């Protein structure tokens, strides 16, 4: 005398694709680099780098959440 | 005497595509770089870089949420 | 004597595409670069860069939300 | 009393680039194809094809010649 | 009393690049194909094909000749 | 009283690059294929094929000749 | 109550006659031939012939087709 | 109550006659031939012939097809 | 109540005659031939012949097809 | 004291060519011939001929005579 | 004391050419011939001929004579 | 004390060519012949001939005579 047919269907396809992806870098070339320093004074913290060709992918992001609560109640 | 059919169908395709994607960089060239520093004084914190060719993908973003509650109640 | 047919169908296509995407960079060339500094005094924090050809994709954004509450009740 | 200085310099760059080159074909999609043939008759030679998506690069050409004769004589 | 210097310099860069080259074909899709042949009759030679997605590079061409004679004579 | 300096320099760089080369085919997909044949009569030679995804590089070409004769004579 | 007579008569004399046919050549004389070649040079393909008398009959053509469907139907 | 007489008569005389046919060549004469070659040079393919008299019949052609389908149907 | 007579008569005389046929060559004469070669040079493939008289009959062609069908059908 | 040199040279080319020579008679046709004769009387010798086509070559002539004498007498 | 040099040279080319020589007769046609004779009386020798086509060559003549005498007498 | 050199040269080539020679008679046709003779009377010798086609070559002539005499007489 009561029929309950709780029959939800989920095919949802939550997707994330982040950073250097599916690319061609055929023949990249860094140039020649020279750094000359004589009588530098630093009173405080130094961060530095020197290079010619840098290729960098960082990607802090690209995360996913699925929250999917299902409830049925009767009385 | 009572029939409840609860048959929702979800095919939702939540998608994120972020950063350098599907590109051609055929023959990118960095030029020659010279840095000459003589008699410099820094009273405080220093950050620097010296490159020639830099390729960079950062992507802090591109995240997904699906929040998807399903409820049926009877009395 | 009562029939309820809760039957929503979802094919929602929530999509994000962000940054350098599907591009051709054939033969980009950075110029020759020289920096000369003699007697610079810095009283406070310094941030710098030197390069010839920089390619940068940042993308802080491009995130998605799908919020999808489904409810049925009876009495 | 006689000085001959035969000194030709050649940097000739004879180049050929032929057919589908450096292209992006993102998402080409062939249609559905049906061929129905009932009661046919062929008295002579038959050539056929049935595709949906064909990508073809032929290039019979694109060849190079450099013809470079160098002569010096004396008497 | 006679000086002959015969000093030709060749850096010639004869080059051929032929057929599908440096391309992206990201997501090419063939459609569905049906061929129905009932009551056919062929009195002479038959050639056929039935594909869905075909990718073809032929390149009969793209060949090179460098022919480059050098002569010095004296008397 | 006679000086002959026969000093030719060759750096010539005859090059051929032929066929499917440096490409990305990221996710190519052939479609479904059906061939139905009932009461076919072939009186003469038959060549056929059936497929779904074909990738073909043929390259009859792309050959090189370098022919480079050097002669010096005296009397 | 129905008489069908199908009595086609074919007497056709389809004929082809090609090349040197039904000739007299009485006393054809080739003359004296001399070729002197001193200091020749050929960078590419050579085809030659040297002779006093040639009587050459080629005939690539001269073929025949008869195509002759006959049909009778009743109901 | 039905009479079908199907009585086609074919006497057809499909004929091909090709090349040097039914000729007199009485006293054909090639003359003296001389070839002198001193200091020749060939970089690529050579085909030659040197004779006094040639009588050459080639005939790539002269073929026949007869195609002659006969059909009677009743119902 | 139904009489079918199927009496096709084929006396067809499909014929081919190719090449040097039915000829008289009474007294053909090749002359004297001389070939002198001193200081020749060949960098690639050579095909040659030297002769006084050639009587060459080639005939690549001259073939026949007869292709015939006879259908009688009743119901 | 006496020299006699009797040294005649005879190259004489005495030649005869008579009758049906070097012809083509291709398709010569004699017509129908009929003779009817009821009650004829012949009182003397009869010579008679009937026929459709005649190709008579008779040649009672065409002969050669060479009458030659060589005499040396001395005293 | 005496020299006799009797040295005649004879190149004499005595030639005859008579009758049907070097012709083409293509398609010569004789007509229909009919002869009817009731009650003729012949009181004398009969020579008679009936026919449609004749190609008679007779040549009673065309002969050659060379009467040659060479005589040397001395004293 | 006396020298006799009797040294005649004979290369004379007495030649005869008579009758049907070097012809083609390709497709010569004699027609139909019929002769009818009811109540004919012949009172003397009869010579008679009937036939469709005749190709008579008779040649009573065409002969050669070479009468040659050599005499040397001395005293």
Numbering used by the authors:
A (entry chain A), B (entry chain C), C (entry chain B), D (entry chain L), E (entry chain J), F (entry chain K), ...: 305 to 379
Sentences from the study reporting this entry:
Abundant filamentous inclusions of tau are characteristic of more than 20 neurodegenerative diseases that are collectively termed tauopathies. Six tau isoforms that range from 352 to 441 amino acids in length are expressed in adult human brain from a single gene by alternative mRNA splicing. Tau filaments consist of a structured core made mostly of the repeat domain, with less structured N- and C-terminal regions forming the fuzzy coat. Here, we report in vitro assembly conditions with recombinant tau that replicate the structures of filaments from both Alzheimer’s disease (AD) and chronic traumatic encephalopathy (CTE), as determined by cryo-EM.
During optimisation of assembly, we noticed that different cations in the buffer caused the formation of filaments with distinct protofilament folds. Efforts to generate AD SFs using mixtures of salts were unsuccessful, but they did reveal novel protofilament interactions (filament types 13–17). Further exploration of the role of salts may lead to the assembly of recombinant tau into AD SFs and CTE type I filaments.
